[PDB]
């Protein structure tokens, strides 16, 4: 179910609120606003274990995206690369349900 | 009556290696308890260029298991090894690249490099750029392993001896044609005084057994006896066959 999680993110970019980037997503986890965090496979290992530990305390689900930041940013419909994506509200999407 | 250039090469003095900027000896880590009974972990500090050598060398920094000192090693860097990677090494190490475990304890068809020929000599075989050796078969009676070498010679090896997994880095540099004599000048200037190769036929008959003649010819067969003495041993030394090498 990888062709799905692309199509779910495309529905979050339209409907939902989200935070692309690490520094900005680290602040949404910390303020208990992030309901899902999505990491690229090639994020720094110290920042994978940073996000995984902040989401431990905030009790947020951490997804690990199939591809890299160039591939993650494409699924977020952006023309730049993103290693950390925190979703505030899914809007009208089924990303946190499944 | 003059000594030939090859005899002059043995003395050294001018034909010695250019080892001023050569960044140490590319040795595989020494055998100890933590290579023999299990594994020891080191970090890859930096992949680094060595003058005269084609393969890049990897500064790998282990921690001394007896002292509070830290031990830096110079491995022949395996293709795909990177900096801030952990290199493991020992009998209970895992079979992925840049990771030096003994040859007995890895399966058949395993590509290795910087392979020890006699156990505990810190890595001798298949440690030129791009080269690899395959482990073919094991022999738990006698504790021995046939390993195919880059030449094509299958050589029996004592199973207890070690090799970084994968091919050596800097591979395929012989595919590029050096366009110009200056690029050849610059190559051998980092190695030793061997390069601008004067052919013996162009020399005089006092310096070389091929020299002299009112035409530039050899006049004796270029193929020569293995037993031949130093000064005559010139041309194709103990040539089994010669000419355009047809078939396999």
């Amino acid at each position: 179910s990888l062709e799905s999680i692309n199509s779910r993110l495309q529905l979050v970019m339209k409907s939902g609120k989200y935070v692309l980037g690490y520094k900005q997503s680290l602040k949404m986890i910390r303020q208990g606003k992030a309901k899902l965090v999505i990491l690229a496979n090639n994020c720094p290992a110290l920042r994978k274990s940073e996000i995984e530990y902040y989401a431990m305390l905030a009790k947020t689900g951490v997804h690990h995206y199939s591809g890299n930041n160039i591939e993650l940013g494409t699924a977020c419909g952006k023309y730049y690369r993103v290693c950390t994506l925190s979703i505030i509200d899914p809007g009208d999407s089924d990303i946190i349900r499944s | 009556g003059r000594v030939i250039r090859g005899q002059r090469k043995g003395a050294g003095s001018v034909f010695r290696a250019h080892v001023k900027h050569r960044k140490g000896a590319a040795r595989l880590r020494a055998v100890d308890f933590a290579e023999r009974h299990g594994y020891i972990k080191g970090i890859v500090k930096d992949i680094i260029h060595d003058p005269g050598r084609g393969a890049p060398l990897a500064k790998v920094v282990f921690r001394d298991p007896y002292r509070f000192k830290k031990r830096t090693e110079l491995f022949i860097a395996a293709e795909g090894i990177h900096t801030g990677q952990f290199v493991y090494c020992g009998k209970k190490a895992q079979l992925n690249i840049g990771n030096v475990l003994p040859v007995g304890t890895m399966p058949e068809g395993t590509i290795v490099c910087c392979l020890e020929e006699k156990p505990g000599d810190r890595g001798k075989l298949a440690r030129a750029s791009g080269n690899y050796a395959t482990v073919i078969s094991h022999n738990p009676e006698t504790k021995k392993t046939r390993v195919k070498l880059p030449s094509g010679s299958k050589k029996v090896i004592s199973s207890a001896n070690r090799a970084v997994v994968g091919v050596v880095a800097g591979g395929g540099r012989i595919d590029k044609p050096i366009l110009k004599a200056g690029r050849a000048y610059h190559k051998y200037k980092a190695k030793r005084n061997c390069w601008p190769r004067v052919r013996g036929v162009a020399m005089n008959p006092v310096e070389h057994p091929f020299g002299g003649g009112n035409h530039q010819h050899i006049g004796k067969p270029s193929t020569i006896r293995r037993d031949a003495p130093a000064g005559r041993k010139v041309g194709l030394i103990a040539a089994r066959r010669t000419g355009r090498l047809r078939g396999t």
């Binding site: 520094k23 910390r30 902040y54 | -």
Partner: protein, 135 residues
Amino acid sequence: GKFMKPGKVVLVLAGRYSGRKAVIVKNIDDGTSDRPYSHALVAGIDRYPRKVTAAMGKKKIAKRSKIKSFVKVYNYNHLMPTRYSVDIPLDKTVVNKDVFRDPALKRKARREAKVKFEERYKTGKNKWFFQKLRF
């Protein structure tokens, strides 16, 4: 959920007191006009108590087990939060944001933190907090 609460143990990430374990006493998670960024007033331990051993003199044990505390405001991203918590009073009056404008108030909040940190070190509770982070 929202996890930067006034009990939480926190690694001070930047500044002079880098790699020091600090108790949050207040958390202003939507910053004021003076500090727009989301900040927290922490009380931490600058000099940790030294490793103390059986068959040391009770006078030597006393000298080893001496905390030097610090009271400081940080950004949330000059702090590394942890799951650990030190349930230590550190009263709102003496340890406060009104404590930096006077140097004499600061020395009291540093002294308030010191005596309170020292008493819970000796009980053996929260002894992860009183170990220095090895980095």
